[PDB]
């Protein structure tokens, strides 16, 4: 059968499937686009966050004021009005950072001496990395022993005294403090990553080159996350006074790109960092996507008329190569972020190259701009700044303005009109055609780089709306008291600025996200007004209505099963019906207990809200249900010292007898005790560490807690509607060793879930690990941007 009809069809189908899979793999290996998750920046002026950068760009403002008077510069003989005297600069102004002199060595594991030895560049890079990691939404403490690449772009320069002469207290740390490799080695060591760490020095085009490398390791597959950035800062006026010898610096210090009055390029300083991930991986895990990088190209200009002389053919070739790698055409680009350094000779060459590379096949004019007009030349910090500007403009749907462009140059020809200089803001709305942009960077060494950036896919739309009645806790942590106070003040301020936010979104973002730190605060407000009230109360200093407490290197909790003493319970049908964990575990144990003890689950767990024969089995049942829900809520137990019925409860929890079997044995105990009236576990009646198997039929306060504390467990948690013997334990807390805290579960008739919210808030208040995804799970809460960590900086300088 199947003669020549079915036999070959199956093989043909299999071969076609294999060919399709192989070609798909080829395409993925060659041209997989990458996605930008988050960005971080530090620019001259008051700019410290990308929002301020976009606000400055939209309002059209420059950030050039003068020179710094903090870094011990002479400032005086720096310009004898004769240009050619030794030690005479030419720039009477510029754009410089005002925060480089300050640092916070306490937050990191850094000693004041070696902190004084640390270069400002890596000093800024550490903060940039931490801020971008928090902005992405990934807890910075989760990235441990994982493949994550770091790529940095710097220029060595100099900071302090020479190594030969040494210092008085800081001698051994001089070498590591000033070295380009340590700039990324320190980041890798602090964050505990394991991917490649690379520092690249390729002049003003360094930063872009870095991201190019970050776009390759991700594509090949040697790393699953990349952090690429650049930095430039000046602790010495040497660069200006040496560049003035070439007479290439404009006096005032501005960039008049494509203007009739070009005089120089000026200098500045800054820092930028981006986080990159494969698009499929990022979308699989739900990480945010801001823009997509598709193709990059790096080239050299070859032999020219000197090292500083630029080339046009190389730029054209690199642009065409980037376009070919991206697999697009010259007509798919709407705007370009040209270099626009503002020099006399560079501008015509770059303009001609861009013309010949883009505008020959163009129906619509191409917009051109340069960020160096607003901020000046930032050396290696540039390149990434252009990328940030382009992505911000594309997201906001507006093209910003370029300054000092009202007087177009006279050495270039614009007869074709294919390139229109950006002098006024231009709307950039969404449409059928996706938006794309290109960024160029050229270095004085002779290396050129080009990149193409595209908008994120418009698939986020389609979110639904769901409501609920469960209130969720709010938590916030920091490493110092003032840090906690400032964080609370900033959160209250931001919540004041932006109204309409649901409590669920803020609760979820302040959930998994910010890391776990010594100083913690937690609460649970009904609405936002009382939330602001308690937040301002925390900001003032007196913590009332919330929970606080330091906890250094504490990660364990202890479950203790108290005996009788929580009587009258306060029947909670809401616990049984609202919580499904009860409605499963307690239901199972109850129907296990039903056949033996004639009493049903209907009669008194129906409750008349308005006898050891009955209570003890039901207290055991509700105890095991509560223990199950607690352990499912992320908090695991430890050795249990449960007394009386607590012995059977601990037997059930630690694995001595099964739920049905433990229920049956407690029913037998109740039936034999209703006549006379009228996993590591810690033994109670003997006081020893025992295995969970010896507990049998034959088996049926001070020294115990001393030994448990001496072991290393310093907290006690009892599952009871009313905490009993708490003071007895509490009095012991100061009596020996470290202090002891006991957390209640319920209150006097307060069976509402809000009581459990307070219990959880008190649990997190003192060194207890809680699985927040488990307690949130399904609520529809989505990520929401929040302010980053506020620091406490101090002056750290070392004069030469």
């Amino acid at each position: 059968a199947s003669t020549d009809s079915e036999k070959v069809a199956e093989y043909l189908r299999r071969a076609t499937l294999d060919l399709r899979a192989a070609r798909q793999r080829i395409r993925e290996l060659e041209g997989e686009p990458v996605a930008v998750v988050a960005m971080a920046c530090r620019l001259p002026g008051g700019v410290s966050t990308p929002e301020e950068f976009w606000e400055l760009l939209s309002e059209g403002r420059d950030a050039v004021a003068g020179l710094p008077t903090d870094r011990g510069w002479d400032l005086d003989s720096l310009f004898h009005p004769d240009p050619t005297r030794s030690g005479t600069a030419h720039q009477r102004g510029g754009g410089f950072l005002t925060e480089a002199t300050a640092f916070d060595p306490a937050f990191f594991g850094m000693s004041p001496r070696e902190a004084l030895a640390v270069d400002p560049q890596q000093r800024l890079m550490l903060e940039l990395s931490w801020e971008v990691l928090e902005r992405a939404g990934i807890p910075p403490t989760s990235l441990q022993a994982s493949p994550t690449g770091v790529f940095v772009g710097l220029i060595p320069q100099e900071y302090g005294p020479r190594l030969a002469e040494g210092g008085e207290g800081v001698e051994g740390y001089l070498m590591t403090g000033t070295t380009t490799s340590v700039a990324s080695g320190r980041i890798a060591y602090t964050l505990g990553l394991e991917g490649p760490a690379i520092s690249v020095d390729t002049a003003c085009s360094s930063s872009l080159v870095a991201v190019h490398l970050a776009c390759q390791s991700l594509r090949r597959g040697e790393s699953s996350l990349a952090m690429a950035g650049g930095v430039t800062v000046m602790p010495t006026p040497g660069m200006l006074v040496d560049f003035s010898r070439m007479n290439s610096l404009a006096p005032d210090g501005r960039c008049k790109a494509f203007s009739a009055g070009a005089n120089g390029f000026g200098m500045a300083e800054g820092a930028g960092m981006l986080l990159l991930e494969r698009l499929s991986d990022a979308r699989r895990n739900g990480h945010p996507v801001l823009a997509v990088l598709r193709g990059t190209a790096v080239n050299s200009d070859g032999a020219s008329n000197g090292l500083s002389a630029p080339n046009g053919r190389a730029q054209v070739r690199v642009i065409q190569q980037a376009l070919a790698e991206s697999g697009l055409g010259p007509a798919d680009i709407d705007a370009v972020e040209a270099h626009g350094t503002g020099t006399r000779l560079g501008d015509p060459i770059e303009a001609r190259a861009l013309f010949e590379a883009y505008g020959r096949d163009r129906e619509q004019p191409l917009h051109l701009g340069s960020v160096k007009s607003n901020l000046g030349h930032t050396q290696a910090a540039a390149g990434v700044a252009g990328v940030i500007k382009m992505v911000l403009a594309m997201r906001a749907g507006t093209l910003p303005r370029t300054l000092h462009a009202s007087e177009r140059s006279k050495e270039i020809d614009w007869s074709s009109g294919a390139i229109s200089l950006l002098d006024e803001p231009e709307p950039w709305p969404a449409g059928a055609r996706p938006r794309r942009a290109g960024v160029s960077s050229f270095g004085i060494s002779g290396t050129n780089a080009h990149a193409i950036i595209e908008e994120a896919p418009q698939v986020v739309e389609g979110e639904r709306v769901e409501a609920g009645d469960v209130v969720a806790p709010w938590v916030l942590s920091a490493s110092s008291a003032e840090g906690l106070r400032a964080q609370a003040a900033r959160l209250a301020a931001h919540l004041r600025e932006h109204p309409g936010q649901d409590p669920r979104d803020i609760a979820y973002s302040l959930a998994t996200g910010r890391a776990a730190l010594p100083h913690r605060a937690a609460f649970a407000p009904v609405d936002e007004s009382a939330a602001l009230r308690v937040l301002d109360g925390l900001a003032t200093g007196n913590a009332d209505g919330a929970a606080v407490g330091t906890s250094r290197a504490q990660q364990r909790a202890v479950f203790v099963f108290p005996g009788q003493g929580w009587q009258w319970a306060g029947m909670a049908v809401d616990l049984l019906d609202t919580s499904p964990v009860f409605a499963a575990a307690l239901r199972e144990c109850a129907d296990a207990l039903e056949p033996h003890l004639d009493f049903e689950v209907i009669p008194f767990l129906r409750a008349e809200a308005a006898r050891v024969d009955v209570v003890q089995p039901v207290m055991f049942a509700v105890m095991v249900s509560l223990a199950s829900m607690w352990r499912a809520h992320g908090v695991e137990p430890a050795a249990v010292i449960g007394h009386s019925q607590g012995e059977i409860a601990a037997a059930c929890v630690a694995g001595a007898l099964s739920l049905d079997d433990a229920a049956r044995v407690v029913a037998l105990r109740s039936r034999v005790i209703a006549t006379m009236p009228g996993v590591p576990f810690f033994s109670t009646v003997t006081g020893r560490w025992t295995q969970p198997d010896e507990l049998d039929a034959g088996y049926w306060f001070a020294d115990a807690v001393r030994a448990l504390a001496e072991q290393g467990y310093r907290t006690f948690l009892e599952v009871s509607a009313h905490p009993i013997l708490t003071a007895a334990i509490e009095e012991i807390g100061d009596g020996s060793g470290a202090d002891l805290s006991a957390i209640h579960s319920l209150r006097r008739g307060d069976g509402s879930l809000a009581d459990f919210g307070e219990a959880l808030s008190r649990a997190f208040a003192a060194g207890v690990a809680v699985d927040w995804e488990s307690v949130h799970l399904g609520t529809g809460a989505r990520r929401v941007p929040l302010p980053t960590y506020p620091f406490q900086r101090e002056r750290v300088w070392l004069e030469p």
Partner: antibody
Amino acid sequence: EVQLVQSGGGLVQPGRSLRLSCTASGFTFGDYAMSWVRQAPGKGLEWVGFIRSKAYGGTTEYAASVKGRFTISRDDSKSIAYLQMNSLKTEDTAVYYCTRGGTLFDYWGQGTLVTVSS
Amino acid sequence: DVVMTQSPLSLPVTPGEPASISCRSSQSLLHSNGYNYLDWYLQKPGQSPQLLIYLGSNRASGVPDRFSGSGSGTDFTLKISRVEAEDVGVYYCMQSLQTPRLTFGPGTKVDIKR
């Protein structure tokens, strides 16, 4: 993907019927004539029977032994394959796999248990 | 009739150095069109069967490489260049000249050399 996910099974006394369902998904079920194979505990895999595609007629073939008590259904609407039992015996206790091809045995299912005893 | 295919029974292996299994036949399996109607199957311990090589020498997608089939229409062979610890189980030769294939045959066995 191209999951199959079989269903059915259990324990039945000798002389009884049962239904086994194979649920094709993740691919076009139009012309992918499938088959049923049986693996006894302690021995190798022995073929039971395949059902052709409707393009070539939709006929079926069986290999002796189980010829008179085994029938195959080809519900195209839900892309479901059915194996129907008839008067089972004790020696038929085996794990049943639902394949994808008729000559080239492609992606396999997960198997059932079905034991006959008393 | 049939070609009564057979294999060299059990073969213990060790991690590292390669291994191979031959497969003989009585009637040539080279079809007139110019192809060999042979394939190989692998059954893992306590798991569903799997397909490795079809039509003489062709690796199906998803196979973790390291497997190579070869041979003329009478003396086929399947060789593994690198031997790991998880590629242990039962291996079956299979033909396609006769459509009413009743059984997969005995099949060879592999284990850890000791």
